[PDB]
Each structure stands twice: as C-alpha cells, then as structure tokens.
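call fold target=Immunoglobulin G binding protein A
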Amino acid sequence: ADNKFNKEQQNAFYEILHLPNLNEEQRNAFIQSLKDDPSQSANLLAEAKKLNDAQAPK
C-alpha cells in the first residue's frame, strides 16, 4: 500500500497492482515506474490495463 499518491496515481498504482493477468515481473515494473514518475499514472495504467487485457487467458 502507498499513500504518497493522491487520486489518479493511487488508482493507477492499486489497479496495476490488482491486475491478475499482469505477472509479478511486469506488475512490479509498472509499479516501479508509477512510483518513479507518478505523472505517467494514466499512461502506465493504460499500458498495464491493455497488457493485462492482452495477457488475459484465451
């Protein structure tokens, strides 16, 4: 849990962390990037969401 994020950054953080189809590697990667530059919240969340969706078992 991280409380240094306000709203969008926080949603992005927790959503990326929540993404089940996003493996620990990429999850921790996007999380790291989220923490490194919170300004990329929507961007990283977008990439992570799209990647999570793409990596969704089919």
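return ok
The chain is about 65% helix and 0% strand. The CA atoms of residues 9 and 34 lie 7 Å apart.
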